[PDB]
Amino acid sequence: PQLHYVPYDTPVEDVMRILKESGTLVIRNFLDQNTVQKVQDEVDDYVRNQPSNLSLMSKTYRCEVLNHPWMHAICERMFGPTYGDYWFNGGAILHLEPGENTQPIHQDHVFYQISKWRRPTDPDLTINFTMALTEFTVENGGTRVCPGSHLWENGHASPAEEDMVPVLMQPGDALILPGSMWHSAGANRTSEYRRGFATSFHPCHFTPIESHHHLPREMVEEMTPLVQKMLGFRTLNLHNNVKVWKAGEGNLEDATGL
Amino acid sequence: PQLHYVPYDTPVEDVMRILKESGTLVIRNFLDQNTVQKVQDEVDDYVRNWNPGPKYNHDIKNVGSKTKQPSNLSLMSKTYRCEVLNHPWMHAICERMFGPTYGDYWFNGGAILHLEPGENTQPIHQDHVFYQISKWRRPTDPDLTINFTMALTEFTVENGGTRVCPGSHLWENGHASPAEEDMVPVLMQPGDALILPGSMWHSAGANRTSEYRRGFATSFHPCHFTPIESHHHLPREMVEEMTPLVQKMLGFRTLNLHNNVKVWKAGEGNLEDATGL
Ligand SMILES: C=C1C[C@@]2(O)[C@]3(C)CCC(=O)C(C)(C)C3=C(O)C(=O)[C@]2(C)[C@H]2C(=O)O[C@@H](C)C(=O)[C@]12C
Ligand SMILES: O=C(O)CNC(=O)C(=O)O
Ligand SMILES: O=C(O)CNC(=O)C(=O)O
Ligand SMILES: [Fe+2]
Ligand SMILES: [Fe+2]
């Protein structure tokens, strides 16, 4: 167990092996700097002086970020074998004000009640992709992980604060956070904001944190068929090819003429 | 255990008690006959199957293309969505079965259960089999889903009335299905309903009569599970006429987990706020 910084061209099989062994990693140059700027600009345009879904606020988020090949290559190998389809769970902007204290160390899957039935050898209930807007430093509250704690049994006490390993990222790097990885944001002891944005996916049989059916139709039709399924507009296929999120007998996209 | 037939005014505690011991039961007079007949009429009025007259009628113009495929029961039948889904027995049981562990529940799926004459016996199964998380679940854990099978026609042994195996909900997950001789047919009049948790081994019988065995099913499951059916193709006029309870059941409102954490949100607010319900 150890925090690994790997390049963008790392083989997918190496990321999964590091994910199983260490429970987290950082994929550098996950997004290019211009995509990092576009999503912040689009969010700033929407909430120009209340924030809603990131896919509603940012065209780059729903058209570019949610089509990221790394997110889908990882999610396919993590959820595919057991659950079949996956879809978008939630997405937020992670903005730390200067002077913010250390966030409590937690696992993301704690709000799944079925996580208590889960065993550390089972596939994760959700996975998070935390992408850096500003740089992440140990002093501005960058996310801290506890490599290997994803294998701890249910009910294991949170890691001690001294066992937390800060994650250092340039803008565009991504930290991969499976739902079982103990982690928390640090205390921003600097004068500037530490800003990041995240995506999360989970099995299609799980209800997402966010619904996207308040989004206008043109916003939906400009999405790829993959992102449309991610955001809850297409019927999902379980591993047995039994279908959930159906429209009576047929597909939801056929009933809505997507 | 034993298959219990209980009257409508049975206390809620006794019903959940029976569900814990035997894993299933029937509530007599769950619905009145006229209500379940309204659902069928509304379904027939939506599908609009061609009904051949007494003799050939020399049809030329406007032939065919009238029949629609069956959609959600909440879309086809106003009685289903405006009355059946507000049933106090469904919500009393779902509250006590899902509330303490999952918080909110919502609609999972409906079904038109019509057994053809000569239909053979259905494989004996558990309804929660299509939840992969059922392999992690213990028999003492709460159920992953519950089904309410309401009879439209009479349910008999010969017409393939649903069979249950009382107590089989407590078997370990690796347990083989019950033998055919273990199954207990469920005899029901129109309006009765079979209460069917996801862990109860059951199956439709062979319909060895010349008439259809007809009925309707509702199912609910915890709010953190994705329902079989989506209802977001439904017209907005339809959603406005459902109760706030049914709007939450059919996926138009934000759901609350047990720890007051919200899922099915609209960004940071409620879905019903972003849609202006
Ligand atoms: C909005 C959320 C909900 C999320 O904050 C929730 C469930 C929010 C409420 C919580 O009790 C905690 C603090 C336990 C929590 C997490 O700890 C997460 O981690 C989650 C699951 C986030 C996550 O994992 O990914 C980011 C992108 C995100 O938007 C997510 C889905
Ligand atoms: O913002 C961060 O660095 C970490 N945030 C979380 O883990 C969270 O919000 O669940
Ligand atoms: O039709 C019946 O009596 C029982 N049906 C089922 O168990 C089913 O459709 O899953
Ligand atoms: Fe987190
Ligand atoms: Fe069944």
Numbering used by the authors:
A (entry chain B): 4 to 52, 72 to 280
B (entry chain C): 4 to 280
Paste lines from the article.
SptF also catalyzed the formation of cyclopropane-ring-fused, highly congested 5/3/5/5/6/6 and 5/3/6/6/6 cyclic skeletons from structurally distinct meroterpenoid terretonins. Interestingly, the unnatural substrate 15 shows a different ligand binding mode in the active site. The D-ring of 15 forms a hydrogen-bond network with Thr148 and Leu199 via water molecules, but also forms a hydrogen bond directly with Asn150. Notably, the lid-like loop region was not observed upon the binding of 15, while the conformations of the other active site residues were almost identical. The C6 enol group of 15 is close to the iron with a distance of 3.7 Å, suggesting that the enolic hydrogen atom is abstracted to initiate the cyclopropane-ring formation reaction via the proposed path c in Supplementary Fig. 9. Interestingly, only the N150A variant lacked the activity for the conversion of 15 into 16, suggesting that the direct hydrogen bonding between Asn150 and 15 is crucial for the substrate binding. In contrast, while Ile63 and Asn65 on the lid-like loop region are important for the formation of 4 and 5, these residues are not essential for the reaction with the unnatural substrate 15, suggesting that 15 is mainly recognized by active site residues but not via residues on the lid-like loop. As a result, all the variants still maintained 24–40% and 56–84% activities toward 10 and 13, but dramatically decreased activities toward 21, 24, and 28 (<20%). These observations indicated that the lid-like loop region is crucial for the steroid substrate recognition, but not essential for the meroterpenoid substrates, which is consistent with the absence of the electron density of the loop in the complex structure with 15.
Here, we report the biochemical and structural characterizations of the unusually promiscuous and catalytically versatile Fe/αKG oxygenase SptF, involved in the biosynthesis of fungal meroterpenoid emervaridones. The in vitro analysis revealed that SptF catalyzes several continuous oxidation reactions, including hydroxylation, desaturation, epoxidation, and skeletal rearrangement. Fe/αKG oxygenases utilize αKG as a co-substrate and Fe(II) as a cofactor.
